[PDB]
Design an enzyme around this catalytic site. Structure first.
Site, PDB file in Angstrom:
ATOM      1  N   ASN A  12      -5.751 -10.886  -2.384  1.00 39.90           N
ATOM      2  CA  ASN A  12      -5.010  -9.926  -1.529  1.00 39.90           C
ATOM      3  C   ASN A  12      -5.257 -10.288  -0.058  1.00 39.90           C
ATOM      4  O   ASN A  12      -6.405 -10.373   0.338  1.00 39.90           O
ATOM      5  CB  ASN A  12      -5.390  -8.483  -1.851  1.00 39.90           C
ATOM      6  N   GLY A  61      -9.178 -10.362   1.008  1.00 40.56           N
ATOM      7  CA  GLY A  61      -9.034 -11.827   1.161  1.00 40.56           C
ATOM      8  C   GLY A  61      -9.285 -12.309   2.582  1.00 40.56           C
ATOM      9  O   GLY A  61      -9.784 -13.443   2.740  1.00 40.56           O
ATOM     10  N   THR A  62      -8.982 -11.463   3.564  1.00 41.82           N
ATOM     11  CA  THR A  62      -9.017 -11.845   4.999  1.00 41.82           C
ATOM     12  C   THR A  62     -10.359 -12.436   5.456  1.00 41.82           C
ATOM     13  O   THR A  62     -10.343 -13.588   5.867  1.00 41.82           O
ATOM     14  CB  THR A  62      -8.310 -10.824   5.901  1.00 41.82           C
ATOM     15  N   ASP A  87      -0.154  -1.850  -4.282  1.00 44.18           N
ATOM     16  CA  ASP A  87      -1.599  -2.013  -4.004  1.00 44.18           C
ATOM     17  C   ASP A  87      -2.290  -0.643  -4.074  1.00 44.18           C
ATOM     18  O   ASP A  87      -1.894   0.296  -3.338  1.00 44.18           O
ATOM     19  CB  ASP A  87      -1.811  -2.638  -2.632  1.00 44.18           C
ATOM     20  N   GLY A 115     -10.254  -5.762   6.104  1.00 38.92           N
ATOM     21  CA  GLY A 115     -10.368  -6.147   7.522  1.00 38.92           C
ATOM     22  C   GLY A 115     -11.059  -7.496   7.706  1.00 38.92           C
ATOM     23  O   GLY A 115     -11.235  -8.239   6.743  1.00 38.92           O
ATOM     24  N   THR A 156      -4.868  -8.148   6.519  1.00 39.92           N
ATOM     25  CA  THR A 156      -5.343  -8.045   7.923  1.00 39.92           C
ATOM     26  C   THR A 156      -5.025  -9.328   8.698  1.00 39.92           C
ATOM     27  O   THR A 156      -4.740  -9.224   9.898  1.00 39.92           O
ATOM     28  CB  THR A 156      -6.839  -7.748   7.974  1.00 39.92           C
ATOM     29  N   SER A 198       0.854  -1.200   0.000  1.00 39.93           N
ATOM     30  CA  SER A 198       0.000   0.000   0.000  1.00 39.93           C
ATOM     31  C   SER A 198       0.893   1.255   0.000  1.00 39.93           C
ATOM     32  O   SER A 198       2.117   1.159   0.286  1.00 39.93           O
ATOM     33  CB  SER A 198      -0.967  -0.022   1.150  1.00 39.93           C
TER      34      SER A 198
END
Lengths: 272, 273
Positions: free
Chosen positions: B219, B199-200, B85, B174, B222, B50
Site C-alpha cells: 500500500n 509502504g511509504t 482500504d 506516513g 503518503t 480510504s
C-alpha cells in the site's frame, strides 16, 4: 438524473428575467464545488467544458461519468447541463454528444459567416435529433474583439435553429459592452443571449445584459483565481502540509463561495 | 477490458516473486497518474480508496464512474482493481461493492476473534457472490503498533475464505523494524498472498525481503501526496501570477506518475501485466 439540455432553463430564464451561470470544469474539485453551489442555492447550472479541459480531465466520457457520479452521491435535484464550450468543429460536437453531453457550443466565429452557418446548422441537425441544445457565436471575444452584426445574428438563427446565441460585443477572456447592439440582437433574434468572458464584468453590466435578453453567462477564470489564491494561502500557513485534501478542500470551498455569489448576482438562486 | 478482483493478480505475484502496488486515489489527477503509470509500465495495479478519500471524492459511485471513464478514455489494457482500504464493517464493504468496487479490505480486529470471523465471513459471502476479492487485517498498523498473532491469522484465513491477508507487523502510515520472522510463519501456514500497509517509509531492502516471504500487495499513499505537494509548491513559488489549476496540478500529476513508476519497478510489477 436531473441532467438536461440548456433549452428549457435558458427559455425560462429569459422569460423570468434572470441568467443561468455556466461555470467551467477543470477537475473533480471544480465539478464538486459547482454542483454543491447549485444545490445549496436551488439554482439551475451549466457545467462548461472546454476542449482543453476535456483533454486535461482525460476525456469527455470521464467528465460525463464523474458528473453522473456526483449527481447520484450528492443527490442533486436542480437542473444541470453538461455543455461543450467553444466547440472547434462539428466532429468535436459529435464526439462530445456521443459521450453523453447534453449541450454544445459550435464556435465558427473566426470563419466567414456562410461557412459558420453551414457547420452550425450541421451541429443543430445532429444535436436536436438527441435532445442536445446548441449555442453559436458571431463576432469575436478577446483573450482582439470583432463585433457581431445584428442582421448576421438574425440570419444565423433563422438559418440554423440554434437554441441560444453568443453575440461578441466587447467581452474578453481572462481578467465596454454594446448594449445598443445586444438589446436589438435580442429583439430581432428572439432567442436567449449568451455572454462570454463573464469574469471581470460589474454587477451593473450583468443586470443590464440580463434586462436585454442575456440568459446565459460564462464564468471560468474567477473560479481559477479564487481556487489558486486559497491554495497559496493554505500551503503558506502550513509549510509541512502534503495531504492534497487539506489544501484542495479549502480551494473547493473557495470555488463554491465564488459560484454562489455569481448565482445570486445572476438571479438563478431559487429558480430550480 | 473491464475491472478485475485482486485474487488472480495477487496469487500470480506471490508465485512469480513480485508485488502489486496499491496506490491510493485522492482525486482525478491522482487516478489519472496511477492508471497512466500502470499502462506505461505494462504492470497490474490496485487503486486504493480510504473511507475518507471516498467521501472527499464525492462518494464511492463517483470513484468507480471516474475510474471506468479513465479506463475507456485512456484505453487501459493492464489489469486494474478498485479496492476499499480498511473497511470498518460489513455495511461499508457492501456499500463499496454495490458502488462497483472489485475488492474490499475488512478489518474487524477491534472485535473478539469469533465475532471477527462472523463479520469477515459475512463480507466474504457477499463479495465472492460478486467476483470481489476480500482482504482482512489482524494487528494494528501505526500512524499504536500491535503485531498480528500467527495462529489468529491462520484460523481467520481457514475459517473465512479470504483471498489475501494483511498482517500488521510494525508498519506505520506516513513517512524500519518489521517482524519478518512472524511474516514467514503467517505466509507459510496460511498459503495466501500477504499484504503490507505503510509502504511509504519502508526501505528497498525491507521491501524486497517482505516480497521474498510472500508479501504480494504493498500500500502506497503518503509518497504520492508528498511528490504532488512538493511539485505544486515549486510551481506556485516560481509562477506568482499563475491561477490556471491545470498549470500546477498538471505537473503534480506527472510527479505522482513518476513516483508510481518508481514503485512499480521497485516492486517488480513492471512488465508483468
Amino acid at each position: 438524473m436531473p441532467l438536461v439540455s440548456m433549452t428549457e432553463m435558458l427559455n425560462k430564464a429569459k422569460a423570468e428575467g434572470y441568467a443561468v451561470g455556466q461555470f467551467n470544469l477543470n477537475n473533480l474539485e471544480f465539478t464538486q464545488a459547482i454542483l454543491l453551489a447549485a444545490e445549496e442555492e436551488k439554482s439551475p447550472v451549466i457545467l462548461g467544458v472546454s476542449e482543453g479541459a476535456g483533454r486535461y480531465m482525460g476525456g469527455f466520457k470521464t467528465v460525463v461519468n464523474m458528473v453522473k457520479g456526483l449527481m447520484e452521491d450528492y443527490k442533486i435535484t436542480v437542473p444541470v447541463a453538461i455543455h461543450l464550450d467553444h466547440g472547434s468543429s462539428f466532429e468535436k460536437c459529435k464526439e462530445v454528444i456521443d459521450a453523453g453531453f447534453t449541450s454544445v457550443m459550435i464556435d465558427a466565429s473566426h470563419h466567414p459567416f456562410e461557412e459558420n452557418v453551414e457547420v452550425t446548422k450541421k451541429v443543430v441537425e445532429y444535436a436536436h435529433a438527441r435532445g442536445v441544445s446548441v449555442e453559436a457565436e458571431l463576432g469575436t471575444v478577446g483573450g482582439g474583439v470583432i463585433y457581431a452584426d445584428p442582421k448576421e445574428c438574425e440570419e444565423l438563427v433563422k438559418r440554423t435553429g440554434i437554441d441560444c446565441l453568443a453575440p461578441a460585443l466587447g467581452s474578453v477572456h481572462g481578467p465596454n459592452l454594446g448594449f445598443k447592439e445586444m438589446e436589438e440582437i435580442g429583439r430581432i433574434t428572439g432567442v436567449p443571449l449568451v455572454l462570454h468572458g463573464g469574469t471581470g464584468i460589474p454587477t451593473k453590466d450583468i443586470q443590464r445584459a440580463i434586462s436585454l435578453g442575456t440568459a446565459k453567462i460564462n464564468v471560468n477564470t474567477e473560479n481559477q483565481i479564487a481556487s489558486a489564491k486559497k491554495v497559496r494561502e493554505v500551503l503558506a500557513e502550513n509549510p509541512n502540509m502534503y495531504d492534497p485534501r487539506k489544501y484542495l478542500g479549502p480551494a473547493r470551498d473557495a470555488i463554491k463561495e465564488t459560484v454562489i455569489g455569481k448565482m445570486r448576482e445572476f438571479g438563478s438562486s431559487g429558480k430550480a
